[PDB]
């Protein structure tokens, strides 16, 4: 950042000598380990796809990602989740071929 030392504008605030604190391990919450990468892969192989995922792979195949995202949104709630989900189904389609 580097504050400007005045009380308005872009980087307002007092200039002080900065430290940089040691990274808190809590900030790595839900980072993928080797263990979880492996287990998650295996369970996908065993369990396979859910009905809505199957509708999504079919819709990508025919009507393209636009219409897929629209359905994934309805099904999951978020658009952020729908983007991520259609990305995951693109990689399932690409792995089979």
């Amino acid at each position: 950042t580097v504050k400007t030392g005045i009380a308005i504008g872009l980087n307002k605030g007092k200039k002080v000598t900065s430290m940089t604190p040691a990274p808190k391990i809590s900030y790595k919450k839900g980072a993928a380990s080797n263990r979880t990468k492996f287990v998650r892969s295996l369970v996908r192989e065993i369990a396979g796809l859910s009905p809505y995922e199957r509708r999504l792979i079919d819709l990508i195949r025919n009507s393209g990602e636009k219409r897929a995202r629209k359905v994934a949104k309805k099904r999951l709630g978020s658009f952020t989740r729908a983007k991520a989900k259609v990305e995951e189904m693109n990689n399932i389609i690409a792995a089979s071929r």
């Binding site: 005045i6 009380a7 504008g9 000598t17 430290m19």
Partner: protein, 193 residues
């Protein structure tokens, strides 16, 4: 129920407010009890002081960031810099706080100073025998008071570069207000090539 030239009032007594009136008649009694409990605690804990040592911190917000005050506890980094572990420090009368981070060298250095001055001015009895009569000081807060740091000198030379603080403030306010539009213009320009 409206008449004359009087302020409009807002007296909220339309609930059963007389069920929940708290008159503090025990004010004097609660003060005697609080004092007896300090005395009783002091005896149980003697010769230790009634309080832990606490760091200095900057108050948050623009309204109070000009002040320093006692914080909850020393950082893990400050305790390490003072040549101490958190587990040990907790037992020797120092408050430690795992949540607070150091992002400012002045406050960090001052807190490390506090911990050094404290370790100088205590005597930890060994965990066996010998125990020499120390005498109880009740307040770490009175022994190690929090000084407000000094900003400047009393007087010095005037240095005028002819800029205008007022203009500096206006320009800073304006630069912020148009940053975003001026980025969009210097994309829509640079795109069309």
């Amino acid at each position: 129920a409206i008449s004359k030239n009087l302020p409009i009032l807002k007296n909220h007594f339309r609930k059963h407010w007389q069920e929940r009136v708290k008159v503090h008649f025990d004010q004097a009694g609660k003060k005697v009890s609080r004092r007896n409990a300090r005395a009783t605690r002091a005896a149980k804990i003697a010769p230790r002081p009634l309080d832990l040592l606490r760091p200095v911190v900057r108050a948050p917000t623009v309204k109070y960031n000009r002040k320093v005050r006692a914080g909850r506890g020393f950082t893990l980094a400050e305790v390490k810099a003072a040549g101490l572990t958190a587990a040990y420090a907790r037992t020797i009368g120092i408050a430690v706080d795992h949540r607070r981070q150091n992002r400012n060298q002045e406050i960090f250095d001052a807190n490390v100073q506090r911990l050094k001055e404290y370790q100088s001015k205590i005597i930890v009895f060994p965990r066996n025998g010998k125990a020499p009569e120390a005498e109880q000081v009740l307040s770490a807060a009175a022994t190690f008071p929090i000084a407000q740091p000094a900003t400047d000198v009393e007087a010095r030379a005037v240095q005028d570069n002819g800029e205008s603080a007022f203009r500096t403030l206006r320009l800073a306010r304006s630069e912020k207000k148009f940053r975003g539009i001026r980025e969009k213009r210097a994309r829509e320009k640079a795109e069309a090539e």
